[PDB]
Design a protein around this nucleic acid. Structure first.
Lengths: 116, 74, 136, 50, 177
RNA sequence: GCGGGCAUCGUAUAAUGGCUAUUACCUCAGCCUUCCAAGCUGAUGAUGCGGGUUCGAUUCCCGCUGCCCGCUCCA
RNA sequence: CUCCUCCUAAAGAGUAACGGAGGAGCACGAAGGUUGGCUAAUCCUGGUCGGACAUCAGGAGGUUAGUGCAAUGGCAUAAGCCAGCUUGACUGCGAGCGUGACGGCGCGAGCAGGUGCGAAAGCAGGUCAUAGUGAUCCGGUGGUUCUGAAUGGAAGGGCCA
RNA sequence: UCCCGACUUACCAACCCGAUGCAAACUGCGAAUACCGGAGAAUGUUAUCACGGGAGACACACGGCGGGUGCUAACGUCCGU
RNA sequence: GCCUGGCGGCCGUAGCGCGGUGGUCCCACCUGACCCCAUGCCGAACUCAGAAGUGAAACGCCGUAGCGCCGAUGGUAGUGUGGGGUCUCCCCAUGCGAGAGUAGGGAACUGCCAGGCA
């Protein structure tokens, strides 16, 4: 019941981002990969996305799914959004504790430039 | 043994659907929710929904529980 | 006599008695005593007609009472004024619409039942007919 | 009702006080809070739960 | 320890054929064991449920958990929020070191232990038998204790029916009568 | 038209939340020729019945089984 | 006899009677704020004492629970439950409304000044909401260099609490 | 062997399952009307709002409809229209 | 073009049962936890390392109507306006018209990454 608990935590933080109308950087974490999307204020479809599942950011890495890999995506999703002109993004935990890989991914997007 | 009632609280819908409201206009006074705060609408401490923005009043059932929301559309 | 063992409220409003009944088919037995008039069946009347049916069939064959006295009728004492709160609950009625099956019966022949449902109908304040079960 | 009225007096030397209630028989600890003093426009410690 | 590694050799080739399983993730695994002391003597006295936690932090390795009461009842004069039981739960390789002491040490030393129960399973494949003696575990000893309070041990495993559970732990030489 | 206990054999405790506490009656025992008077040593209570709220009711909230003072008038 | 909740009340609001039922005259420095988690009642089975029920473990069940206090509207994004840190139970205001014959009462985004919570972003002007209350006068107590009956003070008054 | 309880009793009887009703303080449903808003045309001596001058009135009655109370009594009583 | 994953639209014709089924592509358990971290006890959970194993559980997809759920048509109830009959309560004209239940439907439908033959 790992996913049923996690979407219960997110679905209060997913709101106050629909009622605010904020661009959501959403992070999905999993044992061996790490995902991130940038989604428009509407709930419709994403603007930019980045992960380790692309083979660009596959063998640029020692291992997929650790904190140095999450900082690889952290530069990747941020540098690919600024070229589209998207900042003032809001980070969505999506039920994960902002502590480990997902802290390492939001930290490496704040360096690369995403206004939170 | 009986004989007591209270003053009537004048609850219910104050601005119905399609009505154009200013911001801050009270749209429904209620005790519980029975009406949830959609777009451009605050809930308030006694759950009095109110227009956060100018526009028209819009009721719609939406959600995984068929709950009645109230949006405001300019 | 019949009465609810408990209720959530001691007194009811008077209400009205508009409409037609919902339980109109002989559901359990073979022969029925359907109500064709409209009024109130006090629990004294339902019991008096329950004995008059049972005594006529000589304790033979099953007997259903399809109605229940669940309405508390109040009545103010004598020499008391109007007002001073609602009066005290003195008996219990069943509201009866046209079409209500009051009693049902099987296990007896029909001519013993039409005899026994004629003895019960003289105990009730409501005009009544004898109906038998229908497929559909 | 059976809660007395106390008088939260500021630490900033100004005479600005808040007033509030307190279960005196339950809680005998002097209630102290960091509240706002409009005379000095800083958050300061209010004390003296009467 | 090696009782944990008894699982990787001495059960798998042996319980692959007791039910003709599909996969090695099908072999009934042992998930947790919980060490309950239900102490209904902790309302009038308070200096003994800590004594029930004194040994439970020596019987098993860890600082024990005091449980609350979950519901105010009158048949036992407790409200809710009261210390009523004190359980410990054991996982990892430091549950099979404990479980080695329930095959090497414990079941020798139980009084009139002419048998080991087998109908004690709940029905889903979980064995929960308790011991009446807190003198039988040798971490604590003879010139120490005032009561003989004892405990429960619920074995939890990932079986489906209880004869998978009956034949899921006896393979670790847990005997039966 | 207020409601006070509906408490042990019997009478009085415990009526804003455990265990049930006095006094007689009593069953036994000793004094005495036998009774007394005694002096010792004990016995028992779904706490009228049953409903709620309660974690739990002698305890509250109604019922409601009788009762002791009530007041049922102005013409 | 004032207040709150339900029904009467006729699917907006309101609506009487010595109509039908209940409650209030508080509580809380946490039971408030926030942030991070969490999810019940009952039942079955297993069974150290342990019994219908203490605790533990599983299964069922899906809120029948819980909401400091009546009843109703709510409540899983929990408004329920647990800890971390805290004082926003802030000061000045307030577009705009709702509600009263009025006195009044209520809701309020936003702005200003400061503050708390996030190891980031992301809220808070008391509590799930609705009862928990008393106009004025007359005083009391602090504050205020507003008045200060010739002037300088003061007394008294005002204003603020 | 009071522990057995095998022998079974027109049975007290749950919870569940099926069928049958009733509710004002029941609602997994749900009208007609009424009410709010919007847009249209025709009609109506601005009927509508505001501000001001002067009022009276605040004992209502019955009749229809929806009801409370009463006895589905009252030329009864108390509301809504 | 099927397959998986995130985010949604939608809110039971979408749910549940029952049956079959999928692997390093993805996802899941899983290996280990020494430290970041953390359990009123447990690396269970959270979290961090890294892929030996398995698709058992979970999770998708495909079956099956067993259960929900959806559900006309006609009729009935009720009712606005108008006019009638009389304890109550109905009936006519006209307008609106259910609920329940039948027939039947129904095993949802849909906007980004990645995977593998195209």
């Amino acid at each position: 019941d790992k996913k049923s608990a996690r979407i219960r935590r997110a679905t209060r933080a997913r709101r106050k981002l629909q009622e605010l109308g904020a661009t959501r950087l959403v992070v999905h974490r999993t044992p061996r990969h790490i995902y991130a999307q940038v989604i428009a204020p509407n709930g419709s479809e994403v603007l930019v996305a980045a992960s380790t599942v692309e083979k660009a950011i596959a063998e640029q890495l020692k291992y997929t799914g650790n904190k140095d890999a999450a900082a690889a995506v952290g530069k990747a999703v941020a540098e690919r959004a600024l070229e589209k002109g998207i900042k003032d993004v809001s980070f969505d935990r999506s039920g994960f504790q902002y502590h480990g890989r997902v802290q390492a991914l939001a930290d490496a997007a704040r360096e690369a430039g995403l206004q939170f | 043994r009986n004989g007591r009632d209270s003053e009537a609280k004048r609850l219910g819908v104050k601005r119905f659907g399609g009505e154009s409201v200013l911001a801050g206009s009270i749209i429904v006074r209620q005790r519980g929710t029975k009406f949830h705060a959609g777009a451009n609408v605050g809930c308030g401490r006694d759950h009095t929904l109110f227009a956060k923005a100018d526009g028209k009043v819009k009721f719609e059932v939406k959600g995984p529980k068929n709950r009645k929301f109230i949006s405001i559309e300019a | 006599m019949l009465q609810p063992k408990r209720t959530k409220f001691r007194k009811m409003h008077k209400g009205r008695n508009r409409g037609l009944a919902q339980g109109t088919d002989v559901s359990f037995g073979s022969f029925g005593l359907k109500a064709v008039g409209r009024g109130r069946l006090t629990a004294r009347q339902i019991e008096a007609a329950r004995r008059a049916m049972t005594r006529a069939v000589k304790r033979q064959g099953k007997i259903w009472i399809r109605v229940f006295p669940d309405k508390p009728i109040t009545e103010k004492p004598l020499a008391v004024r109007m007002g001073k709160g609602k009066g005290n609950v003195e008996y219990w009625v069943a509201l009866i619409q046209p079409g209500k099956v009051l009693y049902e019966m099987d296990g007896v022949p029909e001519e013993l039942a039409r005899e026994a449902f004629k003895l019960a109908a003289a105990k009730l304040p409501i005009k009544t007919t004898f109906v038998t079960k229908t497929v559909m | 009702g059976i809660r007395e009225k106390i008088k939260l007096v500021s630490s900033a030397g100004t005479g600005h006080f808040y007033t509030t209630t307190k279960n005196k028989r339950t809680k005998p600890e002097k209630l102290e809070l960091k509240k706002f003093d409009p005379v000095v426009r800083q958050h300061v410690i209010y004390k003296e739960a009467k | 320890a090696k009782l944990h590694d008894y699982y990787k050799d001495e059960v798998v080739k042996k319980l692959m054929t007791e039910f003709n399983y599909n996969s090695v993730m099908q072999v009934p695994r042992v998930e947790k064991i919980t060490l309950n002391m239900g102490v209904g003597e902790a309302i009038a006295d308070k200096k003994l449920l800590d004594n029930a936690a004194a040994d439970l932090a020596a019987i098993s390795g860890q600082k024990p958990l005091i449980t609350k009461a979950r519901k105010s009842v009158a048949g036992f004069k407790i409200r809710q929020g009261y210390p009523i039981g004190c359980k410990v739960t054991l996982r990892g390789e430091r549950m099979w070191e404990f479980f080695e002491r329930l095959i090497t040490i414990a079941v020798p030393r139980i009084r009139d232990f002419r048998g080991l129960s087998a109908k004690s399973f709940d029905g889903r494949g979980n064995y929960s038998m308790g011991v009446r003696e807190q003198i039988i575990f040798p971490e604590i000893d003879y010139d120490k204790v005032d009561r003989v309070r004892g405990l429960d041990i619920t074995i939890t495993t990932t079986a489906k029916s209880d004869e998978e559970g009956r034949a899921l732990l006896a393979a670790f030489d847990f005997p039966f009568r």
